[PDB]
Design a protein around this ligand. Structure first.
Ligand SMILES: Cc1cc2nc3c(=O)[nH]c(=O)nc-3n(C[C@H](O)[C@H](O)[C@H](O)COP(=O)(O)OP(=O)(O)OC[C@H]3O[C@@H](n4cnc5c(N)ncnc54)[C@H](O)[C@@H]3O)c2cc1C
Ligand SMILES: *[C@@H]1O[C@H](CO)[C@@H](O)[C@H](O)[C@H]1NC(C)=O
Ligand SMILES: *[C@@H]1O[C@H](CO)[C@@H](O)[C@H](O)[C@H]1NC(C)=O
Ligand SMILES: *[C@@H]1O[C@H](CO)[C@@H](O)[C@H](O)[C@H]1NC(C)=O
Ligand SMILES: *[C@@H]1O[C@H](CO)[C@@H](O)[C@H](O)[C@H]1NC(C)=O
Ligand SMILES: *[C@@H]1O[C@H](CO)[C@@H](O)[C@H](O)[C@H]1NC(C)=O
Ligand SMILES: *[C@@H]1O[C@H](CO)[C@@H](O)[C@H](O)[C@H]1NC(C)=O
Ligand SMILES: *[C@@H]1O[C@H](CO)[C@@H](O)[C@H](O)[C@H]1NC(C)=O
Ligand SMILES: *[C@@H]1O[C@H](CO)[C@@H](O)[C@H](O)[C@H]1NC(C)=O
Length: 516
């Protein structure tokens, strides 16, 4: 941990090579075009710029425009803000009926997220069957962590929850560790100890400023194609005017537009299921039955306690990890207006005093759905997304196990001081919303199904093995890759930003190696 970042201002030095997409002088030929300035896309673009000319295209603006994205204290504010089409949080509702969000800003979801930083489960690499260069993976985690990851200071509520997880049997005690391993630990954070948010945009500072250009408010609406090869993109600016840019020689287009954005853009560009695209009168460039298939959202289930004495607000740093459930708790100020998707519907009761949100995440999940187009032409119209929560009975069984463990946690001496009534039972807590039921699995199953929310860690839609090869290339198409959370059908860990930050640079290094 010698290499971890320290407290420091958010580093916006990279703004010297950030330009409005209205600037037609950005149009032309590049070695690489990266679509989506997010978690994977920023480190990918910075890495390729070490040697080659890169254009990074991001549909959102710069985070300085929304200062509440730059502090831990601003987390709920960004979700509370109405979506006017320009804000950093884009609201959506899955076809299941569960409210959700994605980012629309340079730095992507790292600019709006809950800051938790973890390295992938070390079993993940061999589970994928990809021939990873594991030494390089680790160097790459260190390259991310040196810029934006701290060892968190003590926070009273996170310490209470960690003592509770240990008492409840979530063993062993791993102390401070970046690694996804069974037991209870303090993990890293991308909020520093002064509350400053650090994010993927800062990895642009590691790019070569002579080689990297970033266009913001660049809405990429189509991949252009030629042996079938990607050659370029069409993007529009904030005034609505169109622009073109191309790759040259042995260069490549990489889509880093997220679980939602990547499949949407491939489908709009004619890459996807042949009879589906034909149904819409979209000319098929490359038939692939899996584009926008195998889309996953790990369920979040939770209870809320209202202690009779105020608790200190925290960011999540203490994790209770089992193979079948990953648990945390956030302590928060009350909410005067709903932070969209924090609770899964807009009619949920809001807390009027300090509260602990006590959470369990289902691994995998095994349930999957799809991204499909709403508009056959307009990339600014959100696609349809369905997750099919709890369609797979294993997911439901694992939520029941997680909920029973949350019962154990509420029964600890660690949590006893936060009860309203000093009675023997967990009914001595005051709850916001639905409490845990009791004994028989059926009451737990109903609880899991009825009270599900998004964990916000959705993934899939452009999977390795379905849409991509083991080098992240789109099968059948030259000079086209995908690097972002669309690429895997299971989580790398409880909190995947660390993995997708690493993956952007790692695939960049693989591209530069493959090319030399
Ligand atoms: C509210 C919330 C809290 C979270 N908390 C945590 C946490 O604490 N820890 C953790 O590990 N994970 C957390 N996650 C999950 C994690 O942050 C994400 O899974 C990860 O950041 C996804 O990275 P990505 O590169 O796939 O997508 P993104 O980072 O969203 O990047 C995609 C980018 O592409 C841009 N874009 C999309 N379409 C286009 C287009 N057509 N043209 C141009 N640009 C386009 C988007 O604007 C965006 O900037 C959280 C997620 C959310 C939503
Ligand atoms: C953080 O501070 C320590 C000295 O306390 C130093 O050893 C280290 O290099 C600093 N880290 C970074 C990434 O700047
Ligand atoms: C780009 O320029 C337009 C005016 O042509 C302006 O309305 C918009 O806010 C600018 N965007 C950024 C990100 O500077
Ligand atoms: C990579 O780092 C992890 C800890 O994150 C360590 O357990 C593992 O042994 C390292 N692998 C290699 C090949 O260095
Ligand atoms: C902490 O952040 C604030 C901005 O919120 C800044 O005024 C202050 O200088 C920072 N503290 C340290 C110790 O760098
Ligand atoms: C596709 O175009 C054909 C005409 O070539 C038309 O008959 C059909 O209705 C169209 N379908 C859609 C969904 O536009
Ligand atoms: C680590 O990942 C593997 C799947 O490859 C799984 O067997 C194991 O349960 C995971 N461990 C935890 C603690 O999540
Ligand atoms: C587009 O989205 C809305 C929900 O946002 C839905 O009611 C409508 O049916 C969708 N249209 C298409 C063509 O899928
Ligand atoms: C649950 O998903 C797994 C995929 O790992 C599959 O083997 C199992 O058959 C699925 N069950 C249902 C009901 O789809």
């Amino acid at each position: 941990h010698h290499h971890l970042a320290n407290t420091s201002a958010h580093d916006f030095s990279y703004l010297k090579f950030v330009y409005n997409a209205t600037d037609t002088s950005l149009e032309g030929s590049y070695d690489y075009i990266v679509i989506g300035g997010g978690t994977s896309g920023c480190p990918l673009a910075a890495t390729l710029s070490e040697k080659y000319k890169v254009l990074l295209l991001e549909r959102g603006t710069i985070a300085t425009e929304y200062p509440n994205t730059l502090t831990a204290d601003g987390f709920a504010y960004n979700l509370q803000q109405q979506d006017d089409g320009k804000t950093p949080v884009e609201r959506f509702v899955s076809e299941d009926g569960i409210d959700n969000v994605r980012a629309r800003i340079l730095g992507g979801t790292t600019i709006i997220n809950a800051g938790v930083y973890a390295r992938a489960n070390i079993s993940f690499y061999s589970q994928t069957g990809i021939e990873w260069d594991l030494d390089l993976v680790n160097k790459t985690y260190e390259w991310v962590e040196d810029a934006i990851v701290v060892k968190p200071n003590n926070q009273s509520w996170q310490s209470v929850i960690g003592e509770g997880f240990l008492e409840a049997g979530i063993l062993p005690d791993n102390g401070f560790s970046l690694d996804h391993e069974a037991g209870t630990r303090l993990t890293g954070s991308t909020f520093d100890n002064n509350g400053t948010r650090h994010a993927a945009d800062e990895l642009l500072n590691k790019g070569d400023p002579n080689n990297l250009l970033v266009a913001v408010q660049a809405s990429v609406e189509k991949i252009l194609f030629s042996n079938l090869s990607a050659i370029g993109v069409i993007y529009t600016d904030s005034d609505g005017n169109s622009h073109q840019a191309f790759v040259r020689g042995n260069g490549e287009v990489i889509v880093s537009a997220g679980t939602i954005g990547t499949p949407q853009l491939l489908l709009l560009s004619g890459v996807g299921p042949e009879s589906y695209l034909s149904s819409l009168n979209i000319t098929v460039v490359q038939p692939n039955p899996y584009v926008g298939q195998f889309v996953y959202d790990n369920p979040r289930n939770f209870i809320n306690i209202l202690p009779p004495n105020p608790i200190e607000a925290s960011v999540v740093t203490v994790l209770g990890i089992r193979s079948d459930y990953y648990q945390v708790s956030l302590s928060s100020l009350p909410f005067s207006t709903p932070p969209f998707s924090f609770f899964p519907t807009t009619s949920y009761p809001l807390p009027n005093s300090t509260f602990a949100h006590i959470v369990s995440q289902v691994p995998g999940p095994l349930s999957h759905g799809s991204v499909t187009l709403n508009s056959s032409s307009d990339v600014r119209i959100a696609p349809n997304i369905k997750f099919n929560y709890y369609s797979n009975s294993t997911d439901l069984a694992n939520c029941v196990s997680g909920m029973k463990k949350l019962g154990d946690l509420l029964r600890t001496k660690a949590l006893e001081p936060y009860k309203a009534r000093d009675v023997l039972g967990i009914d001595g807590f005051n709850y916001l919303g639905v409490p845990l039921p009791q004994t028989d699995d059926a009451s737990f199953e109903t609880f899991c199904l009825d009270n599900v929310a998004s964990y916000w860690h959705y993934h899939g839609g452009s999977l390795v093995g379905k849409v991509l090869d083991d080098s992240f290339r789109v099968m059948g198409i030259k000079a086209l890759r995908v690097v972002d959370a669309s690429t895997f059908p299971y989580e790398p860990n409880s909190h995947p930003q660390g993995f997708y930050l690493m993956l952007g640079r790692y695939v960049g290094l693989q591209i530069l190696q493959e090319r030399s």
